[PDB]
Curated annotation (Swiss-Prot), chain C:
Subunit structure: Component of the mitochondrial large ribosomal subunit (mt-LSU). Mature mammalian 55S mitochondrial ribosomes consist of a small (28S) and a large (39S) subunit. The 28S small subunit contains a 12S ribosomal RNA (12S mt-rRNA) and 30 different proteins. The 39S large subunit contains a 16S rRNA (16S mt-rRNA), a copy of mitochondrial valine transfer RNA (mt-tRNA(Val)), which plays an integral structural role, and 52 different proteins.
Protein name: Large ribosomal subunit protein uL3m
Residues of the full protein shown: 44 to 174 of 348
Location within or outside the cell: Mitochondrion
Disease annotated for this entry: Combined oxidative phosphorylation deficiency 9: A mitochondrial disease characterized by failure to thrive, poor feeding, hypertrophic cardiomyopathy, hepatomegaly, and psychomotor retardation. Death in infancy has been observed in some cases.
Organism whose genome encodes this protein: Homo sapiens (Human)
Similarity comment: Belongs to the universal ribosomal protein uL3 family.
Swiss-Prot record, chain E:
Annotated Gene Ontology cellular component terms: mitochondrial inner membrane; mitochondrial large ribosomal subunit; mitochondrion
Record's protein name: Large ribosomal subunit protein bL17m
SUPFAM superfamilies, alphabetized: Prokaryotic ribosomal protein L17
Keyword list, A-Z: Mitochondrion, Ribonucleoprotein, Ribosomal protein, Transit peptide
Pfam families per UniProt: Ribosomal_L17
Upper classification of the organism: Eukaryota, Metazoa, Chordata, Craniata, Vertebrata
NCBIfam families: L17
Protein species of origin: Homo sapiens
From Swiss-Prot, chain F:
Expression (tissue specificity): Isoform 1 is ubiquitously expressed. Isoform 2 is heart-specific.
Principal location class: mitochondrion
Family (UniProt): Belongs to the mitochondrion-specific ribosomal protein mL39 family.
CDD domains: TGS
UniProt gene name: MRPL39
GO biological process: mitochondrial translation
Lineage of producing organism: Eukaryota, Metazoa, Chordata, Craniata, Vertebrata
Keyword flag Cell cycle: no
Organism field: Homo sapiens (Human)
Illness association: Combined oxidative phosphorylation deficiency 59: An autosomal recessive mitochondrial disease presenting with multisystem manifestations of variable severity. The disease spectrum ranges from lethal infantile Leigh syndrome to a milder disorder characterized by hypertrophic cardiomyopathy, lactic acidosis, attention deficit-hyperactivity disorder, and survival into adulthood.
InterPro entries documented for this protein: Beta-grasp_dom_sf (IPR012675), Pro-tRNA_synthetase (IPR050062), TGS (IPR004095), TGS-like (IPR012676), Thr/Ala-tRNA-synth_IIc_edit (IPR018163)
Protein name stated in the entry: Large ribosomal subunit protein mL39
GO MF annotation, one: nucleotide binding
Keyword Thylakoid attached: no
UniProtKB/Swiss-Prot annotation, chain G:
Tissue: High relative levels in skeletal muscle and testis. Lower levels of expression in the heart, brain, placenta, lung, liver, kidney, pancreas, spleen, thymus, prostate, ovary, small intestine, colon and leukocytes. Expression is coregulated with TWNK.
Keywords, comma-separated and alphabetical: Mitochondrion, Ribonucleoprotein, Ribosomal protein, Transit peptide
The keyword Kinase is annotated on this UniProt entry: no
UniProt similarity note: Belongs to the mitochondrion-specific ribosomal protein mL43 family.
Record GO terms (molecular function): RNA binding; structural constituent of ribosome
Protein name as it appears in the record: Large ribosomal subunit protein mL43
Length: 110, 166, 131, 244, 154, 294, 149, 286
């Protein structure tokens, strides 16, 4: 099937600029109480989630240097340790990961 | 090609009289040859048209369209340009006055079809224009009420004369 | 200019209290209507030919077989009537119709998922909202 | 369908012209002052003490042997030159140089200021309207210091004269849209700045033009601006935590 | 018509659906926190919750060993499941994993999510927190509760 | 005696006279370097003007989100009004309703609604009756209602407001919300404050107590358009902040024979902390019950 | 078109002719050329005709500016401020003489469609028609099927 | 590139016209424009109005105080002979005083029943800032006026127009000048009602006083016609009755508006300013 006539710009504007086609404004945007950047109420903050991934990647790189190869997953718990810290009373018999960096403020030691 | 948008930032008005009111700042900024469709870019420019400078950035940050990130970079450098060069005190006291997109130069390639046929496909490029005016965004026009409709209809009945006579 | 829900700003200690608080009010209102003939009932006219009485609002549970003394297997539908009340009465003159209209509700639902206009209607009636 | 954009431009260096060329860039003014002058601390108090100021200006020229020799070099290339007319002549140049900013008459400004002084004056006021005027003069100008360039540094000889001026000035700078931005058009205030002039002695068509201004570390703070300013802190990526 | 369908249609078929979820589950056991498209994370979350239940049955159980052998492509994680994850949630009866939404990836603007096992050694996620009890709205309801408790004791 | 319709005319003239006088004492332009201390955008430095710039002006430099949410300003550990000019260069911090410990924010909002309730009392009653405000009791936020003690004429000794009378106050309260009148704060000397409130007997006593406590003997003044009142502590920036506003009931304080003191109680909530209709009606019942400060 | 052009009602300037007639033509500007056949008709008009024309109309100021030009023109300015510019390029003496006289008679108003061929400020003398003009009054002004007391 | 000149030349003129549309030039005085001769343009002024104006008096009638002050300032900057020009302040007062006294004669004779308060307003209206300027701008008065600022302010323009009458008053006398006021000022109230020029407040209250002077009982307002009373488009005809005699009937959307208009109808009939009144006699005096 081919068009019988050419549709005018007046007809096209009513279709292209219809409110259904137009972008809907979002009302679920608020500022992150931690860093102040924008975020959605149902989505984790991008800035806050990014700094967690950067630290998580560093931790996982340390784990790879200790196992020294695949198929060497430990059968014990794991503990992340920073500069100026020692293993705790409850962190006994676990695999400690030493980090040459100060413990982040948002990272709460447990 | 035409580049009148850039020259609109070089017009200098005469100094104001003491009795004259504060004239809001006008900032014209644009980006040329954006690899995006002017039809698709229009919905992004229409969305932020009339919004505040900070409100517009909130909509463009969580929008999934590719041009949303392109427009956001234009606003960020235009907001910085307003304070740095156009003597704007508060960077957040801006609203989008004019936000439109224009067709750019497009290359022509060949799209091969079946049966030895072909179709010319263009690599569409578009421009984006934005105008910043210092001051709070104008309040939205209230919906016309029944009183206004009744006032207008009665006014129509009062302006009618006897036609085709003396 | 952003919408909100009932437990957006409530803390961890308030959410269980709010859920229990409104739940107790619903129980009290439903248990305070179980005496209709003592709380000034309307006159009860005798049955007459050509009269139509009000119905119910039931909930479809499922199906269950049923056998008669004739040995025929008849399948029936279990309709559960729960929290069925009369909401308002409209006279024949106000109905603009031949018969008088009566409003009935059922299946008490949450008060946090209704509009302001509907909620205030039930506030004066002293009943939880109906689905 | 094989047509493409004409994107073939590459970035080249404008620092140096093409090498192995007989032609060389001819410069009329030096980049900086050959011997930096540091005004003595407390000169503001001496501004009120005009009698002490007059004696010091005469004594410093006589006590500085080097400054007295550089005058001889200037009179070699220009016999008709006096040191007692230059401080009055400097005011004529100084006043006429600042009157070209209001009317944007850049053609005559190059004859009053050097190529080093021009970018500082005009670049910041390219899209602004300036209303500057000379109300009154408080103290006559004095020839603070005269020093000449080393002989045949680049085939030309440059001579610089340091002149001190203390006069009232009015400044009214409006932004691109005509709104008041800095200064007041009504009330003038005292200005204490040291003006340095320069002239290419080798060039027969050369003349004394404004070169730069000496800004002493003991200078009073300038007039505050009308609007407020926000100075953002260092922008931090998520992996980078804040450090004071 | 799709009424009562609880399982989603992913991959190249029902068999490919299991393999795609098996890779996500195996990567979740090794790293204890992964990010993936929201639909695949939500579908895999049910298997992760029930995987711990088989781990609580003990490594001596033949049926529990086969499920661990099947759902864990990497054989080194099987000792971890019966000696780390299962002891970790011995007191808990369910809800071992938490699922949260994250900003969509720039590649295809796909809805993304992060799923992790509770109690991991990884840095805590910026979990959503309800408004503090010291806010104005909470204090008004706190005052109402106190009087109601006082009135009831009367 | 001056009519109530003209009584506020002279107060505004005195209020504007001192407000412009303080501007005149300040030099033409003085720069104060304001540093931002907060979890968001640390290290930011604001070069503001002394006695001209306000914490709201600083919030506009950062983002519009600060302006919407900065209910109160925390400057050098002390609460600061958003429209109060800054007197010296110092660190600044913004406080919102939704914080870990918004103790000062709730108190600032609670006192602000008390002033708004008093404003509508001076207008609803007829001109023949003498309505004299007493003070704003500093009731705790956990009490569930904010009150504003009012003394009425001897004629209205046994008259009790009805259901319809209270609804008129609520509608007038929303009218003040719709006007979005900003809260203008002005700290003046005790002697200057006595001049404005000389005709009011109860206000003079209240001003007297504030002068004794503060060695500087300064009295804070807040106004909403034409209405002017004396209050303690900083307030919210605008009347549009409160979303739901309603007066519960009126209670007469005892003893009544020597003097009649009425307690106008009510409950309010801001836009940032909007509550659901079902929850809001629960708070209305509590506010109706008489509450007494400790 | 009429729809494609503007229109105006019939009117005059300050009610011309009501108490006295005022010639609305105010100024004539002729730009003739010493050399050039285009002004041959215009040059003859200046030599013999404009002199006698100025005698008849003393209220119109006539300017004859002789400058080199390819198209001679006549500019007529009117009291109401409208300016009408016409070209007399290669016209006979009679055609120019008639054209100039036409400009004298006009009032200066735009030559566009006139909605009505008549204009009166008091069209009614016995009272403009209203629906109650031809309706008789009833006793006590009672409405149809209306009972009083 | 097509050869030729006529098409390229013609297109430039069209472009300049569009330039004058997008960015119209500010208006300037006709005197500054070429083909202007002040001596010739002012002589034709007398012939255009068919009056024997005196050039010496007429030239001083357009000279304003602001023009003289600005003229002196220009020479001060250049240091430049003395000027003995006279302002039109003396002439304007002569024309203004005569015009009000001449209009009063015309109005009180044609309308003997019009109160003196009403006569003042009509004189204040015909000599008003709006009526005079509309007449002034269509008689080549603004072009010949020597002022300091262009366009001529209405206050300045009004003063210059009466100076022309003052110049005409001395040259021609009062009898000839009286026709000039009739032919240029009286004709400005033709299609205008009495209260359209004489704005009043509460016409009903003023009607009661005028009936008391004539020993007329207080009028009684009653409804004569009624239509659509319950609808949003009503029509009321309120009739004023003195001693059970109809004196005026007026329409209106509401009862108060209809009553207010009915009062204006009665006042027009009492003052003799009805639409039925005979038109002003502009014929030559006998
Ligand atoms: Mg192909
Ligand atoms: Mg092929
Ligand atoms: Mg698929
Ligand atoms: Zn964040």
């Amino acid at each position: 099937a081919a068009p019988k006539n050419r549709r005018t710009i007046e007809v096209n504007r009513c279709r292209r600029r219809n409110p259904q086609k137009l972008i809907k404004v979002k009302n679920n945007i608020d500022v992150c109480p931690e860093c102040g950047h924008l975020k959605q109420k149902h989505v984790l903050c991008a800035y806050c989630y990014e700094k967690v991934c950067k630290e998580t990647a560093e931790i996982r790189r340390q784990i790879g240097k200790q196992e020294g190869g695949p198929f060497k997953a430990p059968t014990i718990e794991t503990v992340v340790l920073y500069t100026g810290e020692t293993p705790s009373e409850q962190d006994q018999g676990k695999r400690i990961i030493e980090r040459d960096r100060k413990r982040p403020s948002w990272f709460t030691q447990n | 090609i035409s580049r009148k948008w850039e020259k609109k930032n070089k017009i200098v008005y005469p100094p104001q009289l003491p009795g004259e009111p504060r004239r809001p700042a006008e900032i014209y900024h644009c980006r040329r040859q954006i690899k995006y469709s002017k039809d698709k870019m229009w919905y992004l420019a229409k969305l932020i048209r009339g919004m505040s400078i900070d409100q517009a950035l909130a909509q463009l940050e969580f929008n999934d369209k590719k041009g949303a990130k392109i427009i956001k970079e234009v606003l960020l450098e235009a907001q910085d340009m307003a304070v740095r060069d156009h003597n704007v005190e508060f960077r957040s006291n801006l609203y989008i006055a004019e936000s439109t997109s224009g067709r750019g130069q497009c290359l022509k390639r060949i799209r091969y079809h079946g049966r030895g046929r072909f179709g010319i496909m263009e690599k569409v490029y578009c421009h984006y224009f934005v105008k910043l005016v210092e001051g709070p965004p104008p309040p939205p026009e209230p919906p016309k009420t029944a009183v206004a409709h009744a006032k207008e209809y009665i006014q129509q009945l009062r302006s009618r004369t006897i036609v085709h006579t003396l | 200019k952003s919408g909100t829900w009932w437990d957006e700003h409530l803390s961890e200690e308030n959410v269980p209290f709010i859920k229990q608080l409104v739940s107790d009010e619903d129980k009290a209102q439903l248990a305070s209507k179980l005496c209709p003939l003592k709380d000034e009932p309307w006159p009860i006219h005798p049955w007459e030919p050509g009269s139509f009485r009000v119905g119910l609002i039931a909930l479809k549970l499922g199906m269950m077989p049923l056998w008669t003394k004739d040995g025929q297997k008849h399948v029936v539908t279990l309709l559960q009537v729960q929290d069925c009340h009369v909401l308002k009465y409209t006279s024949k003159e106000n109905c603009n119709g031949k018969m008088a209209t009566l409003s009935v509700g059922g299946k008490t639902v949450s008060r946090f998922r209704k509009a302001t206009s509907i909620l205030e209607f039930y506030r004066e009636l002293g009943l939880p909202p109906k689905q | 369908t094989e047509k493409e954009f004409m994107q073939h431009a590459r970035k080249a260096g404008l620092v140096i012209p093409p090498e192995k060329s007989d032609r060389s860039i001819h410069l009329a003014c030096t980049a900086g002052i050959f011997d930096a002058y540091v005004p003595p601390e407390g000169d503001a108090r001496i501004s009120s003490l005009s009698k002490e100021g007059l004696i010091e200006r005469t004594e410093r020229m006589k006590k500085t042997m080097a400054s007295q020799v550089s005058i001889r070099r200037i009179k070699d290339y220009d016999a008709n030159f006096k040191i007692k007319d230059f401080p009055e002549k400097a005011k004529d140049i100084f006043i006429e140089a600042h009157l070209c900013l209001n009317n944007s008459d850049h053609d005559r400004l190059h004859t009053l200021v050097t190529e080093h002084c021009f970018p500082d004056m005009t670049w910041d006021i390219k899209y602004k309207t300036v209303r500057w005027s000379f109300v009154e003069s408080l103290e006559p100008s004095h020839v603070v210091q005269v020093r000449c360039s080393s002989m045949m540094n680049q085939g030309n000889v440059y001579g610089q004269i340091t002149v001190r001026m203390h006069t009232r000035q009015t400044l009214a700078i409006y932004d691109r849209f005509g709104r008041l931005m800095y200064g007041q058009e009504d009330v003038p205030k005292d200005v204490l700045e040291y003006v340095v002039f320069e002239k290419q002695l080798t060039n027969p068509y050369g003349s004394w033009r404004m070169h730069t201004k000496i800004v002493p570390p003991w200078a009073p703070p300038k007039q505050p601006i009308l609007k407020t300013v926000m100075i953002p802190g260092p922008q931090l990526k998520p992996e980078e935590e804040y450090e004071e | 018509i799709s009424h009562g369908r609880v399982f989603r249609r992913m991959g190249l078929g029902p068999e490919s659906r299991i393999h795609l979820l098996r890779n996500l589950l195996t990567g979740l056991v090794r790293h204890e926190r992964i990010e993936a498209p929201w639909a695949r994370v939500d579908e895999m979350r049910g298997y992760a919750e029930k995987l711990i239940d088989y781990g609580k049955l003990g490594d001596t159980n033949e049926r529990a060993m086969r499920m661990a052998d099947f759902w864990l492509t990497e054989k080194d994680l099987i000792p971890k499941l019966f000696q780390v994850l299962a002891p970790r949630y011995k007191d808990q009866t369910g809800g071992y994993t938490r699922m949260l939404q994250i900003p969509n990836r720039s590649l295809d603007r796909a809805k993304m999510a992060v799923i992790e096992y509770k109690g991991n050694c990884l840095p805590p996620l910026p979990l959503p927190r309800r408004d503090s009890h010291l806010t104005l709205l909470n204090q008004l309801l706190q005052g109402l509760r106190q009087d109601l408790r006082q009135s009831q004791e009367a | 005696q001056l009519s109530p319709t003209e009584l506020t005319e002279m107060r505004n003239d005195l209020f504007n006279k001192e407000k412009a006088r303080q501007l005149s004492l300040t030099p033409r332009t003085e720069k104060i370097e304001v540093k931002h201390v907060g979890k968001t955008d640390p290290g930011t430095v604001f070069v503001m003007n002394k006695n001209i710039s306000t914490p709201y002006s600083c919030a506009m430099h950062l983002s519009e989100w600060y302006c919407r949410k900065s209910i109160l300003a925390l400057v050098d550990g002390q609460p600061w009004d958003m429209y109060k000019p800054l007197t010296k260069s110092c660190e600044i911090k913004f406080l919102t309703f939704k914080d870990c410990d918004p103790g000062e924010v709730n108190k600032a909002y609670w006192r602000s609604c008390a002033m708004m309730m008093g404003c509508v009392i001076e207008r609803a009653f007829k001109d023949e009756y003498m309505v004299n405000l007493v003070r704003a009791p500093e009731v705790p936020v956990i009490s569930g209602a904010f009150c504003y003690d009012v003394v009425l004429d001897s004629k209205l000794d046994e008259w009790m407001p009805t259901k319809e009378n209270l609804r008129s106050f609520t509608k007038d309260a929303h009218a003040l919300i719709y006007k979005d009148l900003p809260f203008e704060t002005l700290e003046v000397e005790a002697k200057v404050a006595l001049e404005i409130f000389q005709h009011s007997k109860y206000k003079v006593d209240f001003i007297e107590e504030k002068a004794s406590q503060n060695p500087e003997r300064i009295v804070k003044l807040h106004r909403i358009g034409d209405f002017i009142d004396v209050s303690e502590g900083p307030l919210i920036p605008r009347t549009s902040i409160c979303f739901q506003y309603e007066v519960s009931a009126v209670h007469n304080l005892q003893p009544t024979q020597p003097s009649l003191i009425r307690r106008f109680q009510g409950v309010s909530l801001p836009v940032h902390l909007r509550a659901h209709f079902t929850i809001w009606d629960k708070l209305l019942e509590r506010s109706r019950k008489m509450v007494t400060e400790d | 078109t009429a729809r494609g052009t503007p229109s105006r009602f019939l009117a005059s300037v300050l009610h011309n002719g009501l108490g006295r007639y005022v010639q609305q033509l105010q100024r004539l500007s002729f730009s003739v050329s010493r050399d050039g056949a285009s002004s041959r008709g215009a040059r003859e008009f200046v030599e013999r005709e404009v002199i006698d024309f100025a005698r008849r109309n003393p209220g119109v100021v006539i300017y004859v500016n002789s400058r080199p030009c390819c198209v001679p023109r006549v500019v007529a300015e009117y009291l109401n401020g409208a300016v009408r510019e016409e070209s007399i390029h290669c016209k006979s003496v009679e055609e120019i003489s008639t054209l100039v006289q036409k400009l004298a008679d006009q009032s200066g108003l735009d030559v566009i469609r006139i909605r009505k061929p008549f204009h009166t400020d008091n069209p009614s003398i016995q009272g403009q028609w209203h629906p109650f003009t031809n309706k008789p009054t009833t006793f006590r002004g009672l409405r149809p099927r209306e009972v009083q007391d | 590139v097509k050869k030729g000149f006529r098409a390229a030349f013609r297109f430039q003129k069209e472009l300049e016209r569009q330039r004058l549309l997008r960015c119209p030039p500010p208006p300037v005085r006709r005197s500054e424009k070429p083909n202007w001769d002040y001596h010739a343009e002012i002589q034709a002024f007398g012939h255009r109005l068919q009056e024997n104006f005196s050039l010496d008096l007429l030239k001083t009638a357009f000279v304003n105080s602001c023009y003289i002050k600005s003229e002196e300032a220009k020479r001060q900057q250049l240091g430049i002979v003395l000027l003995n020009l006279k302002s039109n302040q003396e002439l304007s007062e002569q024309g203004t005083s005569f015009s009000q006294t001449c209009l009063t004669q015309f109005l009180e004779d044609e309308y003997p029943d019009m109160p003196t308060e009403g006569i003042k307003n009509l004189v204040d209206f015909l000599t008003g800032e709006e009526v005079v300027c509309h007449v002034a701008r269509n008689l080549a008065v603004e072009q010949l006026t020597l002022s300091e600022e262009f366009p001529v302010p209405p206050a300045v323009l009004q003063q210059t127009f009466f100076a022309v009458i003052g110049a005409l008053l001395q040259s021609s006398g009062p009898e000839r000048t009286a026709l000039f006021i009739r032919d240029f000022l009286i004709t400005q109230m033709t299609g205008k009602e009495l209260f359209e020029m004489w704005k009043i407040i509460n016409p009903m209250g003023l009607l009661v006083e005028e009936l008391k002077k004539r020993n007329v009982s207080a009028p009684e307002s009653r409804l004569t016609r009624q239509s659509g009373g319950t609808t949003a488009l009503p029509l009321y005809f309120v009739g004023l009755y003195c001693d059970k005699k109809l004196i005026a009937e007026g329409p209106g959307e509401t009862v108060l508006v209809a009553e207010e208009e009915a009062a204006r109808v009665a006042l027009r009939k009492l003052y003799g300013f009805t639409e039925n009144r005979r038109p002003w006699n502009y014929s030559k005096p006998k």
